[PDB]
Amino acid sequence: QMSILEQRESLPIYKLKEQLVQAVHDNQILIVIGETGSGKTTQITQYLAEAGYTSRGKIGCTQPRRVAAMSVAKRVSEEFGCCLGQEVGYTIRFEDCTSPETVIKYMTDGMLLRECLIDPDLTQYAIIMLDEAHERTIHTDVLFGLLKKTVQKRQDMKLIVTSATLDAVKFSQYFYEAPIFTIPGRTYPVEILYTKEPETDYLDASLITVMQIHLTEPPGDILVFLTGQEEIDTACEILYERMKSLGPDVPELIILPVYSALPSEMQTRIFDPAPPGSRKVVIATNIAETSLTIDGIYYVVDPGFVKQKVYNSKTGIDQLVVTPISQAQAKQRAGRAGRTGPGKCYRLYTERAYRDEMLTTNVPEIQRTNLASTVLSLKAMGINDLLSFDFMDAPPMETLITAMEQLYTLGALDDEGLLTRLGRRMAEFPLEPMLCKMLIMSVHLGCSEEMLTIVSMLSVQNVFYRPKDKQALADQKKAKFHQTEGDHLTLLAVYNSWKNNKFSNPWCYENFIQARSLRRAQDIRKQMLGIMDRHKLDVVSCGKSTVRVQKAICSGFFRNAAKKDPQEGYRTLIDQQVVYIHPSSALFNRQPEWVVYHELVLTTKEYMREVTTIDPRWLVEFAPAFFKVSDP
Numbered sequence: 001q002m003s004i005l006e007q008r009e010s011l012p013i014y015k016l017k018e019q020l021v022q023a024v025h026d027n028q029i030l031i032v033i034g035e036t037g038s039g040k041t042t043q044i045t046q047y048l049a050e051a052g053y054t055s056r057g058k059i060g061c062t063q064p065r066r067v068a069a070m071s072v073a074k075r076v077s078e079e080f081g082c083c084l085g086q087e088v089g090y091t092i093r094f095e096d097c098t099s100p101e102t103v104i105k106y107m108t109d110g111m112l113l114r115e116c117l118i119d120p121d122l123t124q125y126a127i128i129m130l131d132e133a134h135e136r137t138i139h140t141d142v143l144f145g146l147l148k149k150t151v152q153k154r155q156d157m158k159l160i161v162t163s164a165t166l167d168a169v170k171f172s173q174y175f176y177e178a179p180i181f182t183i184p185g186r187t188y189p190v191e192i193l194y195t196k197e198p199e200t201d202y203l204d205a206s207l208i209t210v211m212q213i214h215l216t217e218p219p220g221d222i223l224v225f226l227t228g229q230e231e232i233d234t235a236c237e238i239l240y241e242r243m244k245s246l247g248p249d250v251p252e253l254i255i256l257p258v259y260s261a262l263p264s265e266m267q268t269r270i271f272d273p274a275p276p277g278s279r280k281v282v283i284a285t286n287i288a289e290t291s292l293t294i295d296g297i298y299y300v301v302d303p304g305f306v307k308q309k310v311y312n313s314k315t316g317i318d319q320l321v322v323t324p325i326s327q328a329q330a331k332q333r334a335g336r337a338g339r340t341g342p343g344k345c346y347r348l349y350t351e352r353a354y355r356d357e358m359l360t361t362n363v364p365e366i367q368r369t370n371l372a373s374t375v376l377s378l379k380a381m382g383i384n385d386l387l388s389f390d391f392m393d394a395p396p397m398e399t400l401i402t403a404m405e406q407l408y409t410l411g412a413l414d415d416e417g418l419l420t421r422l423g424r425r426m427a428e429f430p431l432e433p434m435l436c437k438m439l440i441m442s443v444h445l446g447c448s449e450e451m452l453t454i455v456s457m458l459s460v461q462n463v464f465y466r467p468k469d470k471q472a473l474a475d476q477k478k479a480k481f482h483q484t485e486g487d488h489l490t491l492l493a494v495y496n497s498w499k500n501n502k503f504s505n506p507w508c509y510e511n512f513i514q515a516r517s518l519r520r521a522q523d524i525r526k527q528m529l530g531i532m533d534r535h536k537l538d539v540v541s542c543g544k545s546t547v548r549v550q551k552a553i554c555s556g557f558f559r560n561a562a563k564k565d566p567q568e569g570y571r572t573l574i575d576q577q578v579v580y581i582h583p584s585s586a587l588f589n590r591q592p593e594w595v596v597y598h599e600l601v602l603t604t605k606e607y608m609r610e611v612t613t614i615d616p617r618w619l620v621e622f623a624p625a626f627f628k629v630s631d632p
């Protein structure tokens, strides 16, 4: 109702409070099932803290995304009555908002995985809650295996797994036929509306649908499912313009973006109720399917797309791609319009496309991703017999062999498949293996000062400010930073000139650089420097000898080597695929014979992102294992 306490007592889980703490008391492992918004994430930790479980250790609860971990920790600290970071806190990659006071901790799946490396028995925890398998992430499958082992060694610890009705028995059977606790909940009818014919521009169709709902449908807030941040920011801008073009005699539409890189002040706005005579539209990614729960939503706009990872078994390369959602996802999206009353779901696709062009459920992430990082993490924990690891959704044998082969050519593993000194040092950093490799190699190549900066700059969102109205001016400002040897050295030049200008916000404004992004890289750099210092890895500058930087990049990213094609674009060394230097690259107007790129991004063309010029001789010098029978 009105107060926080009344709001907490109106949640479906409240009716089962006593029986829930009794079920936890009676069972070491409990599978918890309940409709999204029933209070599983926010209340279970509080119920158990009240029952006295924090006296024995921390209560940890995993979250799949940054915005979810931050959002729930903030809400739970308000309900608990403490400071965020004190009794209730959160941990995400590069941001640990916890203290010696923390008894309730929300963390990303990846952060719990990093704690297992330090302490495989998770001795600091009395309770571990593994919050769902919304989409069965690699981290969920890995944490299930690690905690099935932890539960055997630790008879005192409690394990709570939240689940979907369809997954509950599979999770139960996995956890030694663990009991299932069901939170009954009211689900309301959702009118499902399909398009008569397929829509070309799903972004335009979704904006048209939002405006039609707003002006002609009874009060209730709208939830739009888009594919990413850039798309979301674009949707918001166009909708704002379109709504303003209607003039002042039109009811207010509160346009609210939702993405994992969202500033916290904008995150709180999505939970605020709309004032009378106004309506809000929440433009979100698939975080809004199960992770974030907004009250007052009665309308869902479903264009039918998710950005997910697709793996190539032959090349061993994975890539983010926009594909249709599974039917299970369509059902989850529609269900968001039926939580507090009957609602409507506008599917921007035909009924035939739902029944024929959509998979029932998606393939689990562990079966369509590169597993080099997973294998490196597992080997760092002493798990050498990968065939013995009890996975719920088993990865293909080919993917595990490809992962081993990749780490071996990186120099992380030996012939027997055991970690080398290199692999061990690589495992100490919360980074992708090719990034770890170039950082440890920069120590031996005498450019770790530069590499700490480059790795930190590569770990942040675009630092170049490019407003739609000042695109030509933005490019001229950026061109001043352009280094002849590529994008990585341009990132280094941006950071160093910012440092040399005493980390000035006005300098950033003048040069069209995002100060927030540089402050994030600065913070990441300090944390990476902390790991280097702990493990006595020397921090050395190359000075003017930036060829050392290029070699270190090449020692990690040789797999992404590509040679300039005489006709157009480039051809990858690995599979002779046609790839291109992006128009935003420092190398766009000075395309060299050989390059290495950070990643491939599919837009209109298959574009290389973050390109550095290389000498092909360095491929033999830094990746000799990666080359079969040639002379020269």
Ligand SMILES: Nc1ncnc2c1ncn2[C@@H]1O[C@H](COP(=O)(O)OP(=O)(O)O)[C@@H](O)[C@H]1O
Pocket (backbone or CB within 6 Å): 011, 034, 035, 036, 037, 038, 039, 040, 041, 042, 043, 071, 072, 074, 075, 271, 290, 291, 293, 294, 295
């Ligand atoms: N940051 C937040 N601010 C305000 N309310 C929130 C926040 N995060 C969650 N809530 C509210 O908490 C309630 C309980 O949700 P939750 O614990 O996430 O349920 P479940 O985990 O079962 O899906 C929801 O009705 C939701 O609106």
Ligand SMILES: [Cl-]
Pocket (backbone or CB within 6 Å): 008, 009
């Ligand atoms: Cl209560």
Ligand SMILES: [Mg+2]
Pocket (backbone or CB within 6 Å): 037, 040, 041, 042, 131, 290, 291
């Ligand atoms: Mg939840």
